[PDB]
Amino acid sequence: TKHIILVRHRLTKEGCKQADITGKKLKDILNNKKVSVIYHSDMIRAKETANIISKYFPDANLINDPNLNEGTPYLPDPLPRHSKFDAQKIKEDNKRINKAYETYFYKPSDEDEYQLVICHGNVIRYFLCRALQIPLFAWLRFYNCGITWLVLDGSVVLREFGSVSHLPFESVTYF
Amino acid sequence: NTTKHIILVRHGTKEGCKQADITGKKLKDILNNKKVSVIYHSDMIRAKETANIISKYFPDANLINDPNLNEGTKRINKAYETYFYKPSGDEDEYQLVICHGNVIRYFLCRALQIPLFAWLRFSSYNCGITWLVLDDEGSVVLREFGSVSHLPFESVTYF
Amino acid sequence: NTTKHIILVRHGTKEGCKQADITGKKLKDILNNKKVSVIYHSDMIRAKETANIISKYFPDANLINDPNLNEGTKRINKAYETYFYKPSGDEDEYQLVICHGNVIRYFLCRALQIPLFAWLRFSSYNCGITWLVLDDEGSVVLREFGSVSHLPFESVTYF
Amino acid sequence: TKHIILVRHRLTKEGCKQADITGKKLKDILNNKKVSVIYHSDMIRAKETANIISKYFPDANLINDPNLNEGTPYLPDPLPRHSKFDAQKIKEDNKRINKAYETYFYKPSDEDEYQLVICHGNVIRYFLCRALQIPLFAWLRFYNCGITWLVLDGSVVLREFGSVSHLPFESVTYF
Numbered sequence: 285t286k287h288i289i290l291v292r293h294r295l296t297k298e299g300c301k302q303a304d305i306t307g308k309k310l311k312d313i314l315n316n317k318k319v320s321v322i323y324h325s326d327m328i329r330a331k332e333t334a335n336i337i338s339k340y341f342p343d344a345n346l347i348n349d350p351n352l353n354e355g356t357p358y359l360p361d362p363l364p365r366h367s368k369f370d371a372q373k374i375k376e377d378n379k380r381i382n383k384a385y386e387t388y389f390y391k392p393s394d395e396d397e398y399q400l401v402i403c404h405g406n407v408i409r410y411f412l413c414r415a416l417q418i419p420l421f422a423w424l425r426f427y428n429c430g431i432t433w434l435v436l437d438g439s440v441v442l443r444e445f446g447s448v449s450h451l452p453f454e455s456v457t458y459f
Numbered sequence: 460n461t462t463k464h465i466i467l468v469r470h471g472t473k474e475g476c477k478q479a480d481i482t483g484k485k486l487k488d489i490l491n492n493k494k495v496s497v498i499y500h501s502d503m504i505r506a507k508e509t510a511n512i513i514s515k516y517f518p519d520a521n522l523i524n525d526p527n528l529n530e531g532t533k534r535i536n537k538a539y540e541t542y543f544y545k546p547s548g549d550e551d552e553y554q555l556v557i558c559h560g561n562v563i564r565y566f567l568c569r570a571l572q573i574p575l576f577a578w579l580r581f582s583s584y585n586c587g588i589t590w591l592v593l594d595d596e597g598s599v600v601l602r603e604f605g606s607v608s609h610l611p612f613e614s615v616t617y618f
Numbered sequence: 619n620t621t622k623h624i625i626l627v628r629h630g631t632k633e634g635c636k637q638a639d640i641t642g643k644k645l646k647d648i649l650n651n652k653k654v655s656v657i658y659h660s661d662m663i664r665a666k667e668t669a670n671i672i673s674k675y676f677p678d679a680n681l682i683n684d685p686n687l688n689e690g691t692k693r694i695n696k697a698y699e700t701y702f703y704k705p706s707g708d709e710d711e712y713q714l715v716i717c718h719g720n721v722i723r724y725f726l727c728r729a730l731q732i733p734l735f736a737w738l739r740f741s742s743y744n745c746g747i748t749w750l751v752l753d754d755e756g757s758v759v760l761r762e763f764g765s766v767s768h769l770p771f772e773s774v775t776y777f
Numbered sequence: 778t779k780h781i782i783l784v785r786h787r788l789t790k791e792g793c794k795q796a797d798i799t800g801k802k803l804k805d806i807l808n809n810k811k812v813s814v815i816y817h818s819d820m821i822r823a824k825e826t827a828n829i830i831s832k833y834f835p836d837a838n839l840i841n842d843p844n845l846n847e848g849t850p851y852l853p854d855p856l857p858r859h860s861k862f863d864a865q866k867i868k869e870d871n872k873r874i875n876k877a878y879e880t881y882f883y884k885p886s887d888e889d890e891y892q893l894v895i896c897h898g899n900v901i902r903y904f905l906c907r908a909l910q911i912p913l914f915a916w917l918r919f920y921n922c923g924i925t926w927l928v929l930d931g932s933v934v935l936r937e938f939g940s941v942s943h944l945p946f947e948s949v950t951y952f
C-alpha cells in the first residue's frame with residue numbers, strides 16, 4: 285500500500301463554496317482516520333483553500349511547500365535574451381516539481397495516517413500524467429474532479445470525486 | 460514512402476520481469492509479421508535485462524549495447540544523432556531502443572521539435588512505449604496504439 | 619452482498635450482424651464463467667435479431683420478448699419497474715436487456731436518479747453496453763469495462 | 778464516405794485571433810476543394826466566428842441554424858414551478874439538438890463539396906459523444922481542438938487540429 289490524496293483549488297472568489305464542499309466530503313470519506321498534514325503552495329488561493337479545509341480537520345498541521353508552486357506560464361518568444369532566461373527558469377521549475385512528485389508519491393508511507401496535498405491544476409496534471417502514465421493522446425485533447433485518491437502498488441485503485449453539469453459523482457477505477 | 464520506426468522502450472524485480480515480458484508480447488502483437496532489425500540498449504543493468512526479456516519475441520534482432528544511451532538529468536546528442544537520421548533506400552525498418560525516461564523525453568522533444576514553451580508540459584510524459592516514425596523526407600510523427608497504452612480496465616460510478 | 623447486473627445492450631444489416639456477434643463475444647470474455655439467466659428484448663425485429671446472435675454465447679439463457687421495451691421518444695414505466703427491482707436471496711444474477719437507445723437513456727437516468735438539470739448532458743449518451751448493478755439494499759452503480767468501450771486503436775500526431 | 782467538419786468558436790474578444798488562425802488552417806487543409814456553406818447559431822460570437830472564417834472562403838454561403846443554439850444552462854432548483862417550466866424547455870432543447878445532429882451527421886452527402894459547421898462547445902460535445910459513442914468515463918472527467926473532421930463509414934477516421942500549451946498539433950485517429 286501507499287495512498288495519496290490530491291485536492292484541487294488572486295483570492296478565492298466563491299471557490300470557497302467549492303473548497304468548503306470539498307472539505308465536507310473529505311471529512312466524510314476520511315471519517316475514523318487521522319489527517320496529520322495538509323500541504324499547499326505559496327499561492328494565496330492555495331493557502332485559502334487549505335484554511336477552509338482546516339476547519340474539517342482541526343488537529344491537522346498546514347505545511348507550506350514552495351515546490352507545489354504552479355510557477356510561470358511561458359509563451360512563444362522571438363527574443364533569444366528571453367530564451368536563455370526562460371530555459372534556465374524551466375530547469376529549476378523542473379527540479380522543483382520533480383522534487384514534489386517524489387515527496388508526495390515516493391516518500392515512504394503509517395497506513396491510518398493521511399496527508400492532503402492541495403494542488404494547482406497544472407500540478408495535479410503533472411502528478412497524474414506521470415503517476416498513471418497517461419498517454420499523450422489524452423492530454424493533447426484535454427479535469428472535473430476535486431479529490432483524487434490513489435492506492436498502489438503497478439497496481440492502482442483510483443478514487444475520484446467531482447461533479448459534471450452540477451451533479452456530484454464518485455468513481456472507483458481499477459488499473 | 461520508406462519509413463524508420465524508432466520504438467523507445469522505458470525500463471523504469473520479479474514483477475519488473477513480468478512487465479518487460481508483457482511489453483515484449485504487446486509489441487509483437489502489433490509488429491506481427493514485421494522484422495525488428497535491432498534492439499539497442501544502454502549499459503544499465505535494467506536496460507540489458509529488459510532488452511533480453513523482450514528479445515525473446517524478436518530472436519533474429521541484433522542486440523546492440525550503446526553506453527551513450529546511459530541516462531543523466533550532452534554526449535546524449537551523440538546517441539540521438541545516431542538513431543534519428545533519415546532512412547534511405549526502399550525497405551522499411553523497425554528498431555527498439557531500450558532506455559531511461561529522461562533520454563526518452565529528450566528524444567521525444569528533439570525529434571518532434573517541441574519548443575521551450577511546451578517543455579514543462581511534456582516533462583510529465585512517462586509512457587512505456589514511445590513509437591516515433593521517421594520518413595525519407597526527414598519528417599517525424601508520433602504514433603500511439605491503444606493496446607500498449609496504460610488504461611484502466613474497469614470503473615464503478617455512483618451518483 | 620447479493621447483486622443483480624442489468625446489462626442494457628443497444629441494437630442501434632450484414633455488418634450489423636457482425637457487430638452484434640462481436641458484442642456477444644465481448645460480453646462473454648467479461649462474464650466468463652457466469653450464467654446469464656435471461657436475455658430480454660423488445661418486439662422490434664433488430665432487437666430479436668441481436669438477441670438471437672448474442673444468445674449463441676449464452677445457450678442456457680432464457681430468451682424473453684417484452685413488447686413493453688418497444689421504443690418511443692409512459693408504458694415504459696411498466697418495463698423499468700419490471701427489471702429494476704432489488705434482488706433478494708443469496709445468488710447473484712446477470713441479465714441482458716436488448717433495446718433502443720431512448721429506452722436505455724431513460725433507464726440510465728431513472729436507475730441512477732439523474733436530476734433534470736443533468737438530463738441534457740446525459741442525452742448524448744450512446745454506448746453499446748450499459749452495465750448497471752443493483753444490490754439487495756436498493757442501491758444502483760454503473761460499471762464500465764474498457765474492453766467493451768468504443769475507443770480508437772491508433773493515432774498519429776504531427777507537431 | 779460521409780465527411781463532417783466541426784469548428785469551435787457577448788462578442789468575440791481576441792477569439793478573433795483564434796477564429797482567424799482557424800480560418801487560415803481550414804483554407805490550408807481544404808485547398809482544392811469547394812466549401813459551399815458555413816453553418817452557425819443565432820449567437821453573436823457564432824456569427825462573428827463565421828464572419829471571420831468567411832474571409833477564407835468568399836464563395837461560401839453563411840447559413841443560420843437556430844438548432845445549433847447552445848441554449849440555456851439549468852441549475853439545481855427547489856421550486857417545482859421552475860421544474861415543470863424547465864422539464865418542458867428541456868424537451869424542446871432535445872428535439873432541436875437532435876434535429877441538428879441528424880442534419881449534419883445523417884443528411885445524405887457530393888464528395889468534393891464540404892460544409893463547415895460552427896459549434897458551441899456544448900454542441901460539439903453532444904455531437905461527438907453521440908457520434909463516437911464516447912464512454913461516460915471520459916465525459917464525466919473532461920476539448921483542446923478547434924477543428925474536428927470526421928470520415929465514416931462504424932468505421933471512422935478522425936482528424937483533429939488544436940493546440941496544447943500554445944503548441945499547434947494535428948492528429949489522425951483510427952477507430
